[PDB]
Design a protein around this nucleic acid. Structure first.
Ligand SMILES: [Mg+2]
Ligand SMILES: [Mg+2]
Ligand SMILES: [Mg+2]
Ligand SMILES: [Mg+2]
Ligand SMILES: [Mg+2]
Ligand SMILES: [Mg+2]
Ligand SMILES: [Mg+2]
Ligand SMILES: [Mg+2]
Ligand SMILES: [Mg+2]
Ligand SMILES: [Mg+2]
Ligand SMILES: [Mg+2]
Ligand SMILES: [Mg+2]
Ligand SMILES: [Mg+2]
Ligand SMILES: [Mg+2]
Ligand SMILES: [Mg+2]
Ligand SMILES: [Mg+2]
Ligand SMILES: [Mg+2]
Ligand SMILES: [Mg+2]
Ligand SMILES: [Mg+2]
Ligand SMILES: [Mg+2]
Ligand SMILES: [Mg+2]
Ligand SMILES: [Mg+2]
Ligand SMILES: [Mg+2]
Ligand SMILES: [Mg+2]
Ligand SMILES: [Mg+2]
Ligand SMILES: [Mg+2]
Ligand SMILES: [Mg+2]
Ligand SMILES: [Mg+2]
Ligand SMILES: [Mg+2]
Ligand SMILES: [Mg+2]
Ligand SMILES: [Mg+2]
Ligand SMILES: [Mg+2]
Ligand SMILES: [Mg+2]
Ligand SMILES: [Zn+2]
Lengths: 55, 129, 102, 141, 81, 144, 72, 140
RNA sequence: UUUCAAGUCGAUGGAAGUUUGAGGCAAUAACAGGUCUGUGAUGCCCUUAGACGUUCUGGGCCGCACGCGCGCUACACUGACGGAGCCAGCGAGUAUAAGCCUUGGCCGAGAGGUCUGGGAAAUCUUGUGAAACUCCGUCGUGCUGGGGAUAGAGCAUUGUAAUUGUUGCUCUUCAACGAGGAAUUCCUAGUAAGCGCAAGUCAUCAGCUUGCGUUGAUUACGUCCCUGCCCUUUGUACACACCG
C-alpha cells in the first residue's frame, strides 16, 4: 500500500539519481573519472585527491 | 496541365480515419488499431502498457455500462494525461487534470490517436492590456 | 613453469620514485645475468578538470585548471616467476603500484 | 619501369575508371540510384544522374586500393560533409550506408574487391591487376 | 572490480581525501596533523601524525583498535588487510 | 553538346496546374514555382518522364508537358517512393498522396479545422497565430 | 530586375556572335554576358565550342575562370 | 647496406620524414610522384628545392618521404624542408663538405624555411574569450 | 645613440633575440561586493504533524501587446549546390552490470535496426579519412539553385512518460533579411578572423562554456586627444571618510 507509493518514482539516469560524495548535492556534480563530487566540494578536496594547479 | 474538375462524391459517408470507417473502427481491438496510426503511438504500445492506462480503460468501460438509456456515460476522473485515445473509448467523458482543475472533455471520433491531455490547456492564456 | 617472458607494469603520479624503482629493478636485473627490455616510457596522461572558481555565480568568470599526471612504464623480463616476484618486494614503493602479467 | 595507381592524378583517374565501368556494363546498379541522395547532410541528389554511381564506385575502388581493410562505416564518414543546419552551426554528417554498401557488394561480384580477414574489404588478386591496367591507358595522351 | 588506470589513481586519492577528513572530525581534540597511507603487500599501513598519541592509543589501545574496525566495516576491507 | 538555335518553338509563359511558369527557367527549377513542388520533387518527375534537365521550360513540347503533369498527379504509378510524397498515410483514406497547387491549401486548411474542431492545444495556438511547436515567444516573433 | 538577358540563341544573334567574338582582345564568361547580352550558362557552352572550332585560343583553363583570346 | 640518410621536416603539426638513398633519382610523396601533389597552386613550393640547385643534383640519389599530421598547406612546407635537409645531410656524410656548404648557401639565401623549421605554434586559448587574445564582447 | 651609465634600436649567428611564446602563483591593508540555493559550515528568528520536513501525482520554471544583453545563421558569384581530392590536435571510454567507447558484417533513401568482435586502453573505437579547403561541373545577378524561419503530413531514437512538437530523418510550405541610424565591443603574429573537433553538463537535447588543432591576414609597434587607473603638488568645516 503505502510502501508501494513512498519513494516510488524512479530515481535513476537522472540528476537526482546521483549525489556528491561530500555534500550529497544534486547540482554541479563532477562525474569525470568517477569522482562523483560537487564542484564546490571538489575544490576543497582537490589537493587531498591529488589535483594541483600548474598552468 | 490538360484540365481538372472537382465533382465530390459520397454514399452516406460515415466518418473515417485512415481508411477505416467509424463502424469497424470502434470494435477493432486496440492492438489492431495501433498498427494504423502514427509512429509515436506505435512505439508507445510496443514499449509495454503499464497498469495505469489499462486501469482507466476498465473504469471507462464500466461507466458506459452504468447507463443504458443512451445518454452521456458519466465522468471518470484521471491524472494520466499521457493516455492515447483509442476507438474503444469514443463517446466516454473523462476529467483530465491540468494541474489545478478537472477539465471535462467528451471523446469525439476525431480525437482518436491524440494524447488525452492535449485537449486540456494547463495555463490560462496571456492577455496583455 | 620456469623461465618466462614476464611483464611488470609500473604506474604512479610521481616520477622520482617511479624512476628509482625502475632503475633499481634494472640494476638488480644487471648483476643478475637476466636479459631485459625497458624501461618503456608510455605517453603520460594528463587528467585535467576545469571548474568555476566562484562557489556562487557572482564575479568575473574565472576558472581553475587542475591536473593529475599519470606516468606508466612497462618492463619486460626473461626470468623464472619466482625470481621476478621477489625482485618486486626488493623495490617496493608506496607511491608506485605494480601488476605482473605473463 | 612500370605504372601504378599512385603514379596518376586521382581526379582524372577516377573519371577514366568510371568511363570503363559504365561501358563494361557488368556492374549491377541498384534500382533507386535515380531517386536517392548520397548523404543525409546533402539536400539534392547528384547532378550526373546516369554516371554518378559509376564514378562513386570508381572512387571507392581507388580509395580501397591505397589502404588496408577499410570498412563500409569508414566510407560513409569519408564522403560525408558539412550539414546545412538552418540557424545552428554546421556539423559533419556521414553519407548513406546503402549506397556505399551496395557499391562494395556490387564491386565484390565484379571481381575487384573481397572481404578481408580481420574486417574491412581487401582488394582482390585481380583487383590490383586491372586497376594498374587502367592507369596505363590514362597517361598516354 | 576491473577499474581503469585513470579511475584507479583517482579512487586512491578520493579514498585518502575522505579518510583524512574522517580523522579530522574524530581526532580533532588530539591535534591531528595528517595521515600517510603506505600500501604494501598483504597489508595497508596507515600512519597518523597527532600531537597526542595517548588519546588515540588509550586504555590498552582500545580506541585505535575500535577505530580501525570502523574502516574495515566501511571500505569492505579484510580484517587483516 | 554544342550551341543550337531554334525559331518559333520557344514558349515564354507556361501554364501548369493553373499556375503560370516562366519559360526561360530551367525545367527542374521552373516546376518549383508550382506550390507543392519542391526542388527535390521536381528533380525526380523530370527524371521519371525522361525529360533531360538541360532543357529550358519553353524548349519542352506539349507531349512532354502532359507527360510531367501526369506523373505528378500519379507519383506511385511511376516508382516514386511513398516516403518521398507530400501527404502520406492520409487522414481519411489512409493512402499515400501528394497534394498540388490548388489542392494543397484546401487539405492543409482541412487539417487546421480538424485540429480546431477537436479543440486540441496545437490547434488552439494555430488559431491564435502563435507558434505551436513549443517555441519560446517571450522574446521572439514580435513583428506584424 | 532590368537585366532580362537572352538565354535562347536565335539565328540573328548566332552569326552576330561569330562576327563579334573574333574582334575581342579578351573574351570570358562575363565579357560574353556584358557585350553580347547572352546568359552565363549560354556563354559557357559557347566558349567550350568556339575553342573546339578553332576561333578561340585558350590562354588559361579553370572552372571558375576561363581566360580566352583571339586566335588571329 | 648502401649510402642512406634519413631526415625530417616540420611545420605546425605536419612532419615529413625523408629517406635519401643512393640511386637513379626517385622522388615520391607517400608513394606518389611529386609531379602530382594535390595543392597545385602550391606545386611550386616543392619544386623550389629542385630547380634552385638543378635537377642534376638528384641523379645519384632517390628520395621517398612519408608526411603525416598537420593540414593540407602545413604538409607542403614540411615536405620541402625534409627534401632540402635530406640533400644537405647526404652531402655532409657521403660527399665533401665543400659541396654541402655550397648547396646550403643557395637554399638559405632563398628561403630560411627550406632548412630551418618555423617555430611558430598556436597560442593556447584563455577563458573569458573565444580565442587566444580575443574576449567576449563587453556590455555596460 | 645615451650623463657613455642603466638601457634602446639595427644587423650576424641561432630553433629560439617581443621577459623566447603562453600561463600558474601573487604583497600591506579594504568592500556592508556575492553566496546561509555547495556543504552533517554556522548564530539568531520562523516552522516543526492540516509541516515551510520528506514523499507521490499533475502542472510551472519555456508561459507573450513589449524594452535590453551574450550569441547563431544570413543577406551571395572571393558564392550556392553535385560529384571528386582529402589533411590535425586536445581528449574520453565497461562486468552480473543496471551498462562505456564502439570498428566489422548484414538490412534501411535516410534517420536508424540487427549479428559478432576489440578495447579498463600509445594495443580497439582512431590516421577519430573534421570542416573550412582544392579540382571539375551545374547555376548566371533573379529574393535566384542566396536565406531557411513558420507550418502540414509521415518515418526512427532516448526515456516510466515526448501533449506545450527532447532530438534525428523524408516530402512539402520557403517568411524577414538586398550589408544595417545614433551609438558601441574585441584585437598586434601563427595574433584577429573564419573552420571545424574533443571534454563538461548528458537516458535524450550544445545555437553554451572549457580546450584543441586546420587555413591564416590588414595595420601601429606610437601618444595622452577621449576613457580608466596610479603618482606628485594643492584645498578641505570630511575621518561612519562625498553614500561625508
Ligand atoms: Mg491538480
Ligand atoms: Mg571529408
Ligand atoms: Mg566531400
Ligand atoms: Mg550556408
Ligand atoms: Mg546555415
Ligand atoms: Mg525563452
Ligand atoms: Mg612568463
Ligand atoms: Mg549588499
Ligand atoms: Mg542560517
Ligand atoms: Mg541553505
Ligand atoms: Mg556557503
Ligand atoms: Mg537554515
Ligand atoms: Mg542547509
Ligand atoms: Mg542555486
Ligand atoms: Mg552543489
Ligand atoms: Mg505536506
Ligand atoms: Mg529560467
Ligand atoms: Mg507555455
Ligand atoms: Mg509553460
Ligand atoms: Mg559571455
Ligand atoms: Mg557575459
Ligand atoms: Mg558543393
Ligand atoms: Mg563544395
Ligand atoms: Mg588511436
Ligand atoms: Mg527563394
Ligand atoms: Mg539554399
Ligand atoms: Mg525548412
Ligand atoms: Mg569605447
Ligand atoms: Mg531539456
Ligand atoms: Mg556535448
Ligand atoms: Mg550554460
Ligand atoms: Mg589622461
Ligand atoms: Mg590634511
Ligand atoms: Zn558537494
Amino acid at each position: 500500500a503505502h510502501e508501494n507509493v513512498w519513494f516510488s518514482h524512479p530515481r535513476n539516469f537522472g540528476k537526482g539519481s546521483r549525489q556528491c560524495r561530500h555534500c550529497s548535492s544534486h547540482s554541479g556534480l563532477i562525474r569525470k573519472y568517477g569522482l562523483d563530487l560537487c564542484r564546490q566540494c571538489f575544490r576543497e578536496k582537490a589537493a587531498d585527491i591529488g589535483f594541483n594547479k600548474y598552468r | 496541365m490538360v484540365d481538372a474538375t472537382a465533382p465530390k462524391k459520397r454514399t452516406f459517408k460515415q466518418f473515417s480515419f485512415k481508411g477505416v470507417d467509424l463502424k469497424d473502427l470502434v470494435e477493432m481491438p486496440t492492438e489492431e488499431f495501433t498498427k494504423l496510426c502514427g509512429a509515436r503511438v506505435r512505439r508507445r504500445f510496443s514499449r509495454g502498457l503499464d497498469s495505469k492506462p489499462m486501469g482507466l480503460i476498465k473504469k471507462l468501460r464500466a461507466a458506459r455500462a452504468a447507463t443504458e438509456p443512451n445518454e452521456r456515460p458519466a465522468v471518470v476522473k484521471t491524472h494520466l494525461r499521457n493516455m492515447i485515445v483509442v476507438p474503444e473509448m469514443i463517446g466516454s467523458v473523462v476529467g483530465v487534470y491540468n494541474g489545478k482543475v478537472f477539465n471535462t472533455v467528451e471523446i469525439k471520433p476525431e480525437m482518436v490517436g491524440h494524447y488525452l491531455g492535449e485537449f486540456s490547456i494547463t495555463y490560462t492564456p496571456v492577455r496583455h492590456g | 613453469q620456469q623461465i618466462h617472458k614476464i611483464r611488470i607494469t609500473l604506474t604512479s603520479t610521481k616520477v622520482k620514485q617511479l624512476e628509482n624503482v625502475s632503475a633499481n629493478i634494472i640494476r638488480n636485473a644487471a648483476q643478475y645475468n637476466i636479459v631485459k627490455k625497458g624501461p618503456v616510457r608510455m605517453p603520460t596522461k594528463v587528467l585535467k578538470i576545469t571548474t568555476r572558481k566562484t562557489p556562487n555565480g557572482e564575479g568575473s568568470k574565472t576558472w581553475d585548471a587542475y591536473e593529475m599526471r599519470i606516468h606508466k612504464r612497462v618492463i619486460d623480463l626473461q626470468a623464472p616467476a619466482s625470481t621476478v616476484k621477489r625482485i618486486t618486494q626488493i623495490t617496493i614503493e608506496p607511491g608506485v603500484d605494480v601488476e605482473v602479467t605473463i | 619501369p612500370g605504372v601504378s595507381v599512385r603514379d596518376v592524378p586521382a581526379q582524372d583517374f577516377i573519371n577514366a575508371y568510371a568511363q570503363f565501368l559504365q561501358r563494361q556494363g557488368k556492374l549491377e546498379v541498384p534500382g533507386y540510384v535515380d531517386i536517392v541522395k548520397t548523404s543525409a547532410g546533402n539536400d539534392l541528389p547528384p547532378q550526373e544522374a546516369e554516371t554518378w554511381f559509376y564514378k562513386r564506385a570508381a572512387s571507392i575502388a581507388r580509395h580501397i586500393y591505397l589502404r588496408k581493410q577499410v570498412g563500409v562505416g569508414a566510407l560513409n564518414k569519408l564522403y560525408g560533409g558539412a550539414k546545412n543546419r538552418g540557424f545552428r552551426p554546421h556539423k559533419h554528417v556521414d553519407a548513406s550506408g546503402s549506397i556505399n554498401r551496395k557499391c562494395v557488394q556490387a564491386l565484390q561480384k565484379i571481381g575487384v574487391l573481397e572481404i578481408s580477414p580481420k574486417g574491412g574489404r581487401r582488394i582482390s588478386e585481380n583487383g590490383q591487376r586491372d586497376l594498374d591496367r587502367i592507369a596505363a591507358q590514362t597517361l598516354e595522351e | 572490480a576491473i577499474l581503469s588506470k585513470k579511475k584507479k589513481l583517482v579512487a586512491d586519492g578520493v579514498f585518502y581525501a575522505e579518510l583524512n577528513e574522517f580523522f579530522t572530525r574524530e581526532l580533532a581534540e588530539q591535534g591531528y596533523a595528517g595521515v600517510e597511507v603506505r600500501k604494501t603487500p598483504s597489508k595497508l599501513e596507515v600512519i597518523v601524525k597527532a600531537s597526542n598519541t595517548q588519546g588515540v592509543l588509550g586504555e590498552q589501545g582500545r580506541r585505535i583498535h575500535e577505530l580501525t574496525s570502523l574502516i574495515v566495516k566501511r571500505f569492505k576491507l579484510s580484517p587483516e588487510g | 553538346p554544342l550551341v543550337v538555335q531554334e525559331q518559333g518553338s520557344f514558349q515564354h509563359i507556361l501554364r501548369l496546374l493553373n499556375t503560370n511558369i516562366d519559360g526561360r527557367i530551367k525545367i527542374m527549377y521552373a516546376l518549383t514555382k508550382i506550390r507543392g513542388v519542391g526542388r527535390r520533387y521536381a528533380n525526380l518527375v523530370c527524371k521519371k518522364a525522361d525529360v533531360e534537365l538541360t532543357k529550358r521550360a519553353g524548349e519542352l513540347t506539349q507531349e512532354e508537358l502532359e507527360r510531367i503533369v501526369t506523373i505528378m498527379q500519379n507519383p506511385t504509378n511511376y516508382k516514386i517512393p511513398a516516403w518521398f510524397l507530400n501527404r502520406q498515410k492520409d487522414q481519411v483514406d489512409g493512402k499515400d498522396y501528394h497534394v498540388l497547387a490548388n489542392n494543397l491549401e484546401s487539405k492543409l486548411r482541412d487539417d487546421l479545422e480538424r485540429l480546431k474542431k477537436i479543440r486540441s492545444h496545437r490547434g488552439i495556438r494555430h488559431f491564435w497565430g502563435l507558434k505551436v511547436r513549443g517555441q519560446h515567444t517571450k522574446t521572439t516573433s514580435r513583428g506584424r | 530586375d532590368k537585366a532580362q538577358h537572352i538565354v535562347i540563341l536565335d539565328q540573328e544573334k548566332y552569326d552576330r556572335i561569330l562576327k563579334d567574338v573574333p574582334t575581342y582582345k579578351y573574351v570570358s564568361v562575363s565579357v560574353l554576358v556584358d557585350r553580347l547580352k547572352i546568359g552565363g550558362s549560354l556563354a559557357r557552352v559557347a566558349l567550350r565550342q568556339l575553342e573546339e572550332d578553332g576561333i578561340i585560343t585558350p590562354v588559361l583553363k579553370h572552372s571558375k575562370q576561363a581566360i580566352y583570346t583571339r586566335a588571329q | 647496406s648502401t649510402q642512406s640518410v634519413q631526415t625530417f621536416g616540420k611545420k605546425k603539426t605536419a612532419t615529413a620524414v625523408a629517406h635519401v638513398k643512393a640511386g637513379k633519382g626517385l622522388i615520391k610523396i607517400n608513394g606518389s610522384p611529386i609531379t602530382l601533389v594535390q595543392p597545385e597552386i602550391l606545386r611550386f613550393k616543392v619544386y623550389e628545392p629542385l630547380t634552385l640547385v638543378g635537377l642534376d643534383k638528384f641523379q645519384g640519389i632517390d628520395i621517398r618521404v612519408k608526411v603525416t599530421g598537420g593540414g593540407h598547406v602545413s604538409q607542403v612546407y614540411a615536405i620541402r624542408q625534409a627534401i632540402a635537409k635530406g640533400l644537405v645531410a647526404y652531402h655532409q656524410k657521403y660527399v665533401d663538405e665543400a659541396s654541402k656548404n655550397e648547396l646550403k648557401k643557395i637554399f638559405a639565401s632563398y628561403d630560411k624555411t627550406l632548412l630551418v623549421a618555423d617555430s611558430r605554434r598556436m597560442e593556447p586559448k584563455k577563458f573569458g574569450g573565444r580565442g587566444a587574445r580575443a574576449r567576449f564582447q563587453k556590455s555596460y
